[PDB]
Design a protein around this ligand. Structure first.
Ligand SMILES: Nc1ncnc2c1ncn2[C@@H]1O[C@H](COP(=O)(O)OP(=O)(O)OP(=O)(O)O)[C@@H](O)[C@H]1O
Ligand SMILES: Nc1ncnc2c1ncn2[C@@H]1O[C@H](COP(=O)(O)OP(=O)(O)OP(=O)(O)O)[C@@H](O)[C@H]1O
Ligand SMILES: Nc1ncnc2c1ncn2[C@@H]1O[C@H](COP(=O)(O)OP(=O)(O)OP(=O)(O)O)[C@@H](O)[C@H]1O
Ligand SMILES: Nc1ncnc2c1ncn2[C@@H]1O[C@H](COP(=O)(O)OP(=O)(O)O)[C@@H](O)[C@H]1O
Ligand SMILES: Nc1ncnc2c1ncn2[C@@H]1O[C@H](COP(=O)(O)OP(=O)(O)O)[C@@H](O)[C@H]1O
Ligand code: MOO
Ligand SMILES: [Mg+2]
Ligand SMILES: [Mg+2]
Ligand SMILES: [Mg+2]
Ligand SMILES: [Mg+2]
Ligand SMILES: [Mg+2]
Ligand SMILES: [Mg+2]
Ligand SMILES: [Mg+2]
Lengths: 272, 267, 272, 267, 272, 55
């Protein structure tokens, strides 16, 4: 006798690969875990600008604490580009560069959290965010974390640059939590038809509204991860993500109230 | 040039096609080129208990004399119970992912205790684990095969079942470390035209590519379907073999490069 | 070889095995660490029933948050029986099976806490429970933890089944804290003279009240750990523990107010 | 049967006598059958400093060439000071247990530093035990002898002193891993009729069973009394040895199988 | 090609050792992270006195919880002297004795925190104090930590006794946070001209007011670490630290309100 | 009953028309701990059953 010892359950014995056999059990829309949460992603390039950009943003965030329950997630920025330069020079694979770039996002989080410490804000770690965010947002009005996901050496291969970066990790968290929204804070007004700081800037036209699918079919650079558009197609809760200019005071506050001040990205989720 | 790659890295978005192409020309370093990642099945092997695990333990102890092994564990029926409870509550795939990791952790602990007297340990090596692999007295480690995505798990197109589980966790380990081989040790001779437990009529498939596998439109598979896409995007592990761990010697022969099960190639 | 280097203390030089020499120093009743705490143990088999049982219990727990300061501890259930079946088939000792079964109690805790995340409830780890429960119950109204104790490979030998399980761990915690009470949430009305779901259920007579010493002299099966009766004999604070049916809405709420809706187990603690 | 055991495990309470009897018939696997657990005394050895620790370190480094050792540390006088302060405040045994663990941690760190240049590590995750014990160059690990019960410590019948301390922590590790022997290395030739430091006419007891030892009604003992009950319920370690570590060669002779000191048998 | 790959920054390329090159970037006085924080250091020798000293201190601390935001840090005491005796007998270096002595400071912290658990006070670990003090002081009114700094095997050589002990670690934290003050709770009235409990206790005279510079040039014993005077010379925020007798109820409360009830130590801070 | 009581006689009248509270306990406040016990449902005094019939 060498049979499989099974636990009686509606998913027992099956592989979970047959979508016809798993649909009766798990094929439903998930619930919202933290429906009152607002997730704000701060771009690493915004943090790279130093006090000239961080100080006004800290003041805006300070005045937002009595209004929203905030999960603030920081990007990586230029320092991740250098560890890519060294890592690619050493030939390291994409799963090696993913945690190296994530470290710079965490350091940006410690910097931002320190500026808000007097308001009761501190940086929290990924296991704390994944399992104990509820208790931490009951203790204080906002916490800071790294926007990068903990994919590490399990990062997807294909490109030598880690695909699941700050925008993608922040959206995965916001949608899994069923949060009230995700706002991406950029160093530009939003998404353009070309790089507004690149070689073809003269033809860049500002896009006030767009769909993730249309941007996924796009060719050329974007201010957000291309993997963000891919996880937006499988989103379950968040219907829109707005990219706003964090260098203009008040736009983050306006975006958190649903006001159109940047580029609105429509996900694959429709209302009910 | 590296000067243009470094220039693009500082002046362009990481989404820029110019940057992506320059990074693709970088050198390719394999961290553990002499090692082999094997997955010991969860539902297919470990859930069978002593009759299946004990022979494979003896085979592993004998095989590590000639091959460096990173031994990943599946989860199995306890994860399916957890998935059923959580899915019935409407919990998202990210929550189910952490639940499944615990089951693979349990299986790694049980396999490691049977291997402890042979020096083979259970590892959570954050920076790899070079010492136990390096030593001829050990030459093997046991790890939990679930990916670390946790709440950041990418959901499937439909449903809350995490699409990346212990098949993808072990494969991405082999790909990241540039291992020479990835062997899935389960309870069937290999891939069949259908689930051999529920279709008496299934035919064994000794060799197939990802494109040919997708064209057949399989309702069920011996491997997680997203792994086929990870295989096609992989830089180091361009093929995998699925072997029957219930037949003594299949793992040892597969480690020596023999074709004893189903070989699934990226191209 | 040369003399012991002692620190001058009332217990210095002592082996601590002589009860006559240790009594003047340590023989007194301990203080209560968290006297306002209420501990609730949710059976693993209750969680095994899925949404049909969890959803009504989550709603009852939601209404209890403004009334009590709750430490919610979850049991293991049927999944621990399977890891026992595999582990015993592999010949693993009892200290190996104890942490494997505890894992299922932890997973049940993560599941239950996720359902209450929107209320500020999160799962907390054993070191957090042992050393930081006070600050966590100051941040939020309730936390969830694993009811199993961290005995691990130091589990007691004798039985091939781990004796210090969810009921025992929950009571050890509640009594060590000096909590106001411990309530055990079961899938049956309480303790019977026989298994009300077993072959002799026709003989099963409900016991509205019992003593731990009378139950410890029994031989038949019980809905609680037999080790629970042992640690009840040496308890210091909790005088009674009620086992109530969590499948009947309102019984947990009633038990937390001292209302008799299940089986009352008298411990060895005493006086007014 | 396994079929009987698996049916009982899923349909009965774990307290059911039928389930308990079926589980007792399961196979018995020893995780580290060739290893020996030794306790280096806290108050009896390590608190004595160089004159006691240095010769035992030399003996351990020599003994590990022939014997695999798990070296557990006692706590000692610093724990008694902590127990005194906490007991004076009325803190429960579970709080005292955590305080005592830190003292045994200190002693493990100090002993491990003296053994670091010999390759012997201080281990404390469970996970670091497999590699160094297998390596003949190492063949030993140091660990802190306090049990992990923490606030979940079972209290004694009277008082707040934790009844399970470094004697029980070392013994239960020997029992769990199926080690071949447990040796307590302290500062007396063995068990006596009474505390030999305070009773001048105490008589040395070379051998005794747990039942006869509990029959004596000893006011004091060289081992924690609850360990006698753990010994009677043990599956693998059915006797313990207590030796005088202040006499050179006593530990080596005990490892060679000589009945140096006192042997306490479960039956 | 072997050139250094630099990230363009105001501190790029330079070694950070040229004080003339680093001053235009980092030469300014830092901000205060937690200006409303009050740090209280409890001497290990105060805890060593047991319930006779701890119970009145706990009652005084209890009444201070609604008045201040407290970071309570505990010293090591006599048990560290024993681990020094054994460690030095074994010949262990100063970097080995430092974490061993720090353990006794942590144990004192767990003891004190347990007495205040019913008030919501818990012991928190050094990484928690270093990165998440703000969120924890938003959850509860006070937290307890070890006053020893995590110098570990990187302790400074020179003395066989670890120099960076409880007083030094407490001040390093308090000044780095920019806290409103640091109060050192001793088993004596303050600093004397000689050890008031030593062989020359008949010569000891009370010093109501001292400066860290004059104390550092002193030779002979002090109730505070000599490294405390060194870090006081480079202090950035805290201008004075008071050493008060914790065996006299009310002195800690008075010192926290700026009342002169012990020895004042003027630091190197004169903001001009 | 006729004769004196430690509670208002009107309390008994409003207990007959009570809608929620099923029992009210009268405890001795001069004995420390009895109020704490009564708030936890422990019987340390006189229990008065109202008109609310429990399920
Ligand atoms: N289509 C586009 N629309 C707008 N900006 C673009 C576009 N393509 C490229 N960019 C450029 O990308 C820049 C933003 O870069 P990026 O998104 O990498 O930084 P970040 O998001 O702050 O960093 P991180 O992702 O590490 O948080 C903008 O300054 C802009 O010049
Ligand atoms: N004397 C008894 N009185 C009542 N129930 C009994 C008795 N003996 C056996 N049982 C059975 O035990 C069952 C409860 O099982 P058990 O206590 O193992 O689950 P649980 O407590 O939810 O799980 P866990 O201990 O992992 O939290 C009841 O359904 C009942 O059928
Ligand atoms: N110049 C001095 N003035 C006052 N006390 C002194 C002086 N020199 C030595 N002492 C002695 O030091 C004692 C305090 O000891 P110490 O500062 O080491 O303990 P502590 O600060 O409570 O412990 P820890 O530093 O571990 O927190 C006093 O009781 C006093 O006898
Ligand atoms: N087309 C197929 N060919 C072969 N096996 C299949 C196929 N479809 C499903 N299977 C089944 O998948 C099982 C292995 O997957 P799974 O149950 O997830 O085990 P594991 O825990 O090892 O992943 C095999 O037992 C086999 O019966
Ligand atoms: N009946 C006895 N026989 C032998 N030794 C005893 C007895 N009773 C007490 N002891 C004492 O117990 C001591 C060992 O226990 P302990 O001081 O706790 O050491 P450790 O810290 O190593 O456990 C010995 O030094 C011995 O003096
Ligand atoms: O058992 Mo899994 O989670 O499908 O690998
Ligand atoms: Mg599978
Ligand atoms: Mg961007
Ligand atoms: Mg002892
Ligand atoms: Mg039960
Ligand atoms: Mg340098
Ligand atoms: Mg001092
Ligand atoms: Mg009255």
């Amino acid at each position: 006798t060498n049979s499989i010892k099974h636990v009686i359950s509606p998913l027992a014995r099956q592989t979970l690969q047959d979508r016809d056999l798993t649909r009766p059990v798990a094929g439903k829309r998930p619930i919202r875990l933290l429906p009152w949460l607002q997730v704000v992603k701060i771009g690493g390039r915004v943090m790279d600008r130093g006090a000239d950009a961080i100080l006004p943003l800290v003041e805006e965030l300070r005045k937002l604490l009595p209004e929203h329950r905030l999960l603030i997630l920081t990007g990586a920025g230029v320092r991740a580009r250098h560890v890519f330069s060294v890592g690619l020079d050493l030939g390291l694979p994409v799963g090696s560069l993913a945690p190296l770039a994530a470290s710079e996002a965490g350091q940006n989080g410690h910097i931002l959290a320190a500026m808000l410490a007097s308001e009761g804000v501190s940086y929290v770690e990924h296991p704390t965010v994944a399992d104990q965010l509820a208790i931490h947002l009951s203790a204080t009005r906002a916490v800071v974390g790294s926007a990068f996901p903990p994919y590490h050496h399990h990062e997807f291969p294909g490109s030598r640059i880690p695909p699941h970066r700050a925008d993608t990790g922040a959206f995965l968290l916001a949608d899994a939590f069923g949060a009230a929204g995700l706002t991406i804070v950029e160093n530009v007004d939003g998404i353009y038809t070309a790089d507004p700081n690149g070689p073809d800037r003269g033809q860049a036209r500002f896009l006030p509204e767009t769909s993730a699918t249309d941007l996924a079919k796009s060719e050329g650079p974007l201010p957000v991860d291309r993997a963000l558009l891919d996880v937006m197609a499988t989103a379950r809760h968040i219907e829109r993500v707005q990219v706003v200019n964090g260098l203009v005071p008040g736009r983050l506050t306006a975006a958190l109230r649903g006001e159109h001040v940047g580029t609105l990205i429509r996900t694959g989720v429709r209302p009910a | 040039s590296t000067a243009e790659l470094e220039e693009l890295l500082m002046q362009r978005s990481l989404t820029d096609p110019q940057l992506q192409a320059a990074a693709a020309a970088a050198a390719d370093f394999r961290i553990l080129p002499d090692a082999t990642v094997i997955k010991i099945g969860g539902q297919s092997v470990i859930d069978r208990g002593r009759a299946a695990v004990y022979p494979l333990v003896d085979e592993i102890v004998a095989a590590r004399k000639n091959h460096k092994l990173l031994i990943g564990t599946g989860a199995g029926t306890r994860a399916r119970h957890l998935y059923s409870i959580a899915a019935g509550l409407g919990l998202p795939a990210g929550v189910l992912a952490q639940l499944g990791s615990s089951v693979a952790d349990q299986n790694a602990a049980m396999l490691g205790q049977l291997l402890a007297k042979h020096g083979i340990p259970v590892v959570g090596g954050a920076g790899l684990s070079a010492v136990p692999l390096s030593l001829a007295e050990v030459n093997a480690v046991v790890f939990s095969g679930m990916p670390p995505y946790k709440l950041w798990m990418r959901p499937a197109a439909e449903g809350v079942i995490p699409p990346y589980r212990t098949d993808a966790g072990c494969f991405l380990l082999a790909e990241q470390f540039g291992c020479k081989q990835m062997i899935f040790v389960k309870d069937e001779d290999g891939l069949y035209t259908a689930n051999p437990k529920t279709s008496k009529d299934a035919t064994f498939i000794p060799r197939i590519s990802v494109d040919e596998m997708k064209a057949k439109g399989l309702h069920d598979s011996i491997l997680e379907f997203p792994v086929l896409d990870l295989l096609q995007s992989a830089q180091h592990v361009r093929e995998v073999q699925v072997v029957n761990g219930l037949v003594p010697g299949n793992l040892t022969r597969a480690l020596a490069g023999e074709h004893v099960g189903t070989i699934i190639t990226a191209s």
